[PDB]
Amino acid sequence: MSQFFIRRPVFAWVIAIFIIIFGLLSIPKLPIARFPSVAPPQVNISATYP
Amino acid sequence: IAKLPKGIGYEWTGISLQEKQSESQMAFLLGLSMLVVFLVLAALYESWAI
């Protein structure tokens, strides 16, 4: 059943508070980019025979 | 070091850099370790006052 969180509202609020806190501790921890590494990686091999 | 001629910096290395880094984190690690138990006790004793 799902009638557990009507008579126990405080148990509902701490799960909502936990993921607010863990999420707010991670927005400074995330890199900001315009795109992910969608392009295939290249490895250049450059020689010289002047 | 603040009495030196201007333009002379400094840094800590070795055991000292790992000591200064250990002192900046104590107030945060004692903050979370008291905030977590306050949250998990509200999940068991159905209230905020207890």
Side-chain angles (χ1 to χ4, degrees), chain A residues 10 12-23, chain B residues 35 38-39 48:
Chain A
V10 193
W13 267 119
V14 272
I15 314 184
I17 280 173
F18 259 125
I19 51 180
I20 280 177
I21 284 175
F22 292 156
Chain B
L35 182 57
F38 175 71
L39 281 195
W48 307 99

Side-chain angles (χ1 to χ4, degrees), chain B residues 1-12:
Chain B
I1 284 160
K3 300 183 187 60
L4 293 177
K6 183 180 183 294
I8 300 296
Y10 80 108
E11 261 184 56
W12 297 103

Side-chain angles (χ1 to χ4, degrees), chain B residues 4-46:
Chain B
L4 293 177
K6 183 180 183 294
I8 300 296
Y10 80 108
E11 261 184 56
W12 297 103
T13 182
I15 186 71
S16 298
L17 167 67
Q18 305 297 323
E19 173 183 352
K20 174 148 294 305
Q21 191 154 343
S22 169
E23 303 265 338
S24 70
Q25 310 174 333
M26 158 246 283
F28 184 74
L29 295 179
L30 263 74
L32 272 182
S33 298
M34 296 172 61
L35 182 57
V36 159
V37 275
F38 175 71
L39 281 195
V40 78
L41 275 183
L44 271 28
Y45 296 140
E46 27 300 357

